[PDB]
């Protein structure tokens, strides 16, 4: 609607580099830009060039071919969202792991948003492999691409934008009843919670995968997981596995998925 626009003032970039930029970050360079195609792709191509983007954070309040999972996409309305891409060194750590790291990214753009709503409504929290879910409607996607030796970590964080302007599926932090969602504030608590759990990645931390087991909507539920290349299987979610894999109950057998899309059965 034209009167959400009124709820969407524009992101305060030298507030920001104030807040994160400086002793105590691990952020080394902010930037906010008014329009790209997309963010994620704007950090591969620096990384492609030779930059060294870890700690590197891009910022775009509009976002015009956005990227999705599997060559799909993502669509955005300017100032409706948080659209953000950071880069991660991650040759330190073996290959094995790095499926954790899109993990990580999810459980903290959840913990940056989970106190603003007054009551916590049912299906609130993490769908695997990548989605922040609240009332059963999309309020994040998270997208993790490769280019060594690093990996760039993309957001999108539903905050006004309304699900008539992106999709039927989606959700925002408005339509789950924030009358008034400061987007400077929420990004500032996101980009914290996600050094945190970028750092607790590096290091194995074991508080990494218990925090994401207590937030699973996909744990002990009956899912339907569509595999790369179409086909579905049907079973109960059990447990993540070290490589951030979904391993699925099959009437008894173990299946263990590494992408996929989930689907929550009754
Ligand atoms: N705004 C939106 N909110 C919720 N759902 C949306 C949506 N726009 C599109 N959809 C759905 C959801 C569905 C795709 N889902 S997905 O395959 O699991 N992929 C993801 O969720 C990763 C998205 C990462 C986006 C960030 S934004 C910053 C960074 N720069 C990028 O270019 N990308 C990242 C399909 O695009 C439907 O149309």
Known sequence: ????????????????????????????????????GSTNADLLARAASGADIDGVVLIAEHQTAGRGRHGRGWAA??????????????????????????????????????????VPPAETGLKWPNDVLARGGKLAGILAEVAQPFVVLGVGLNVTQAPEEVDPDATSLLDLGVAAPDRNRIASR????????????????PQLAADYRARSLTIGSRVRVELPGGQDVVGIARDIDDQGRLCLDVGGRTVVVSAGDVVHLR
């Open 1 to 36: 609607v034209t009167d959400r626009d009124r709820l969407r003032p524009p992101l305060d970039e030298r507030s920001l580099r104030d807040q994160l930029i400086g002793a105590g970050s691990g952020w080394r360079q902010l930037d906010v830009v008014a329009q790209t």
């Open 77 to 118: 309305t300017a100032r409706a969202q948080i659209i953000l891409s950071v880069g991660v060194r991650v040759v330190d750590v073996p290959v094995q792991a790095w499926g954790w790291l899109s993990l990580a990214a999810g459980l903290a753009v959840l913990d940056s948003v989970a106190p603003l709503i007054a």
């Open 190 to 205: 996101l980009l914290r919670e996600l050094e945190a759990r970028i750092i607790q990645w590096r290091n194995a931390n």
